[PDB]
RNA sequence: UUCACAUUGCCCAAGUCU
RNA sequence: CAAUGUGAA
């Protein structure tokens, strides 16, 4: 329960296909290199405080440090030893005691081992010199975000308006292959304060054209929100904006202009507007700080704006990732060759090959039989596996009578009926209940009425007017206070129906009340299958940026039939951004004895697919719910031990991959096709992990996949666990399309945000009342209603 | 709240000194 | 999932 097995073997299915990869090959001399340890004082003091008190400690005492690099905190490297037996310095700043002492030698050799076959493991701390070595310039030079690092784009401005533009940059990343050691870049781009007078700064988030008498309360209150908590210099940071204007603005020995006038001998401008306090200075005599990213939520046009800027399609990004790094230069980088190191300026090729993607089989009467090409197929001429005959079913409109008219519901009804009875899920009659209702108070009793009513009432659709506080109290109502399968819809698609849409739309009310919209061509599936498997799809999802309080959530799903269609959710709620599963050893119990009510079959092997989970992550998370999954099996019987794969989906890591020929190149965005595999060249030089770009991108440059095995009881070949990750995205019952992700994992997702909703605007005493709110009626524990 | 893909928001990382 | 885009039988 702790070491990730060995690569089993390479992957042989699919036609190939030749590929770029974002990965830039490194040569790493043969040397040792010096690690020292550097202890400043005080010790509170930023990151980039530190880099700056270094370097300007290193050339000061250059003749007693005869070009070393420092990661901004406790760590320095030197390509050649110093003469330093610990020793403590003395520093001045534009008063710092700096100990600096050696530790260890690190072997880059070592490192040639670990990439070759001699070392099981790749040393992390010969990996982290190198990222050390290849940070050291650009954390000062740029603004370092992340991995990322960001500056302001010379020649170009892109105002988001505000006081906010668009910063470009670009990830960095040094990481061992089965090739060389490997430098991944990717350009990204993201929101920073203008470097601006707060005055400017004043005018544009009031939308001012000029500078238009003191402030209103409005004015002051908008104003003040925007700049509280900022930077700016004449180096201070933003606390309040005073009610009164520098005119009347008092301090104790004596207003604010006044003073600036005495002592400066600066009469101010414009004495009319407020104070920033940080003491109080005037708006004239300040300047935003640069290099402020914007952590606040962007508004809708600023988003529309940044979308505008950051959209690329393949070629383009390809193009842009190649141009950066043609003028980035690292070989010229000081620091770089001082360590000996050369990197490539062209994208590394790697092999890449396309499986086959699965036949999907319908029901009905033809029994009709799909074939995905590129990543999507249709319903068109086809029947659900198993089709549910809807008897008894109500309308609830939210939406005004004036904008959704009884013609309107009468004609959407009747086009859905069609759709519905083409798709093998006949609507038999008109609703039994068709009313209009607003607000969020109506909801409880109207559904209430309906099931106290309406025997065996099966479904009610919901309409609703757009974006509105209903959508919540009609899931809270539905899922966890009567047991209720709820169907909403949006005004405007039905005022407008289509047949994509209404069609679409029957994928998920037919899986909502127990249906089977199609199966993997049960020949066509691994050998896996040969014996009962339990497919789990876990993941914790995060509050935003800048939350403290709202809790984490936790969901696991399973699969509970052998096709495999049918899903269970379990569902958490936990310690804020913690991403280990607490309870996931009750959540996969109750997913195993529902496996074994549905099937009668006990798991002999049980396959989880655990999204979200980084590199740093992996040993943490696999020893604590590896072992979770194991006390699942342990309580339920005396030596039940199935075989456990853990495997890590990550889809937003900094791998992108191209087609090599424009040939290849599929689309209008121009991206890799469906079904694309990569297991050699770029991916771990012992473990066990592979690429999978299982979707068709439609738009953008695609995000690959990439799956991690850190367990595998199971023993899979390369072969089988690609085919059957792949065919697993081809079983996502909201889509006629193979998705991004194994369905398990994207159920999850839509598990935890169904939980986030329950959740809105109330998030010991306190878990209780959180855990309450995520749990489902007891009619709804075994329904998809999460489709 | 028809749906997928894409950008960002999510663990690690990053960030915090008159 | 929220904001914003591009798309679909
Ligand atoms: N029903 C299958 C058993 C089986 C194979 N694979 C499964 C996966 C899940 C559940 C059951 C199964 C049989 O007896 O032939
Ligand atoms: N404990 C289950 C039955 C069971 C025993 N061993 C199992 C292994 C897997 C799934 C279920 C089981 C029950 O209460 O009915
Ligand atoms: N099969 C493993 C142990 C194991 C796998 N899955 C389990 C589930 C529960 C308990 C133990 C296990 C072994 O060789 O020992
Ligand atoms: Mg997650
Ligand atoms: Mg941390
Ligand atoms: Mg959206």
């Known amino acids: 329960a702790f070491k990730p097995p060995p690569r089993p073997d390479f992957g042989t299915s699919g036609r190939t296909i030749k590929l770029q990869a974002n990965f830039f090959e490194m ?19 930023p990151r980039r405080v530190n880099r700056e008190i270094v370097e300007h400690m290193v050339q000061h005492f250059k003749t007693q440090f005869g070009k070393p690099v420092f990661d901004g905190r406790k760590n320095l490297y030197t390509a050649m030893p110093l ?51 290849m940070r050291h310039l650009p954390s000062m030079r740029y603004t370092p975000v992340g991995r990322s690092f960001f500056t302001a784009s010379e020649g170009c401005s892109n105002p988001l308006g505000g006081g906010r533009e668009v910063w470009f940059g670009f990830h960095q990343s040094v990481r061992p ?36 008498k003191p402030l209103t309360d409005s004015q002051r209150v908008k104003f003040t929100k925007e700049i509280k ?74 988003t529309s704006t940044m979308i505008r800027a950051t959209a690329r399609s393949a070629p383009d990004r390809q193009e842009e990732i190649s141009k950066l790094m043609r003028s980035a230069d690292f070989n010229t980088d000081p620091y770089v060759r001082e360590f000996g190191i050369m990197v490539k300026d062209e994208m590394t090729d790697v092999t890449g090959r396309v ?25 068109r001429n086809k029947q659900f596996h198993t089709g549910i005959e809807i008897k008894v079913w109500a309308i609830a409109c939210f939406a005004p009578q004036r904008q959704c008219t009884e013609v309107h519901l009468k004609s959407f009804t009747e086009q859905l009926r069609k759709i519905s009875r083409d798709a093998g899920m006949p609507i038999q009659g008109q609703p039994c209940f068709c009313k209009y209702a607003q607000g969020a108070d109506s909801v409880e009793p109207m559904f209430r009425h309906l099931k106290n009513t ?8 919901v309409i609703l007017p757009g974006k509105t506080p209903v959508y919540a109290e009609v899931k809270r109502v539905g899922d966890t206070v009567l047991g209720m399968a709820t169907q909403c819809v949006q005004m405007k698609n039905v005022q407008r129906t289509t047949p994509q849409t209404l069609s679409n739309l029957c994928l998920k009310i037919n899986v909502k009340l127990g249906g089977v919209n199609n199966i993997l061509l049960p020949q066509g599936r691994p050998p896996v299958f040969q014996q009962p498997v339990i497919f789990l799809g876990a993941d914790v999802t995060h509050p935003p940026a800048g939350d403290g309080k709202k809790p984490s959530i936790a969901a696991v799903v399973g699969s509970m039939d052998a096709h495999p269609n049918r899903y269970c959710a379990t569902v958490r709620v936990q310690q804020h951004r913690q991403e280990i599963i607490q309870d996931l050893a009750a959540m996969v119990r109750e997913l195993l004895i529902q496996f074994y009510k549905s099937t009668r079959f006990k798991p002999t092997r049980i396959i989880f697919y655990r999204d979200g989970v980084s590199e740093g992550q992996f040993q943490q998370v696999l020893h604590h719910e590896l072992l979770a999954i194991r006390e699942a099996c342990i309580k339920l019987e005396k030596d ?20 090599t020929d424009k040939n290849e190149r599929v689309g209008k965005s121009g991206n890799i096709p469906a079904g694309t595999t990569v297991d050699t060249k770029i991916t771990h030089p012992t473990e066990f992990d592979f690429y999978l770009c299982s979707h068709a991108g439609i738009q953008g440059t695609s995000r690959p996949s990439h799956y991690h095995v850190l367990w595998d009881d199971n023993r899979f070949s390369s072969d089988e666990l690609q085919i059957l990750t792949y065919q697993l995205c081809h079983t996502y019952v909201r889509c006629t399309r193979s998705v ?48």
């Open 640 to 659: 039940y031990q199935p075989g456990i794969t853990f495997i890590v989906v990550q889809k937003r890591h900094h791998t992108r991959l191209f087609c």
């Open 454 to 461: 309406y025997a065996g009432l099966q479904l009610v659709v």
């Open 229 to 302: 908590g900022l930077k700016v210099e004449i180096k201070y940071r933003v606390c309040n904006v005073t009610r009164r204007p520098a005119s009347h603005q008092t301090f104790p020995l004596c207003t604010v202009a006044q003073y600036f006038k005495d002592r400066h001998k600066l009469v101010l401008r414009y004495p009319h507007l407020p104070c920033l306090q940080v003491t109080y200075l005037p708006l004239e005599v300040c300047n935003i700080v640069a290099g402020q990213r914007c952590i606040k939520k962007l508004t809708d046009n600023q």
């Open 740 to 787: 991004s992700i194994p369905a398990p994992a994207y159920y999850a997702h839509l598990v935890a945000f169904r939980a986030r909703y329950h959740l809105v605007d109330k998030e010991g005493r306190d878990h209780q009342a959180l855990a309450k709110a995520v749990q489902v009626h007891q009619d709804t524990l075994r329904t998809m209603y999460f489709a």
């Open 83 to 133: 003469p330093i037996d610990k020793v403590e310095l003395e520093v001045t700043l534009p008063i710092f005691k700096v100990s600096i002492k050696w530790v260890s030698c690190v072997s880059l050799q070592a490192l040639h081992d670990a990439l070759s076959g001699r070392l099981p493991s790749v040393p992390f701390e010969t990996i982290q010199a190198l990222d050390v070595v």
């Open 177 to 212: 292959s089965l090739w060389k050691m490997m430098l991944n870049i990717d350009v990204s781009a993201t929101a920073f304060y203008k470097a601006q007078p707060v005055i400017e700064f004043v005018c544009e988030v009031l939308d001012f054209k000029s500078i238009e």
């Open 27 to 45: 040569d790493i001399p043969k040397i040792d290199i010096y690690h020292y340890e550097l202890d400043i004082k005080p010790e509170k003091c």
């Open 355 to 379: 499986l086959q993607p699965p036949s999907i089989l319908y029901g009905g009467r033809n029994k009709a039989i799909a074939t995905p090409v590129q990543g999507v197929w249709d319903m």
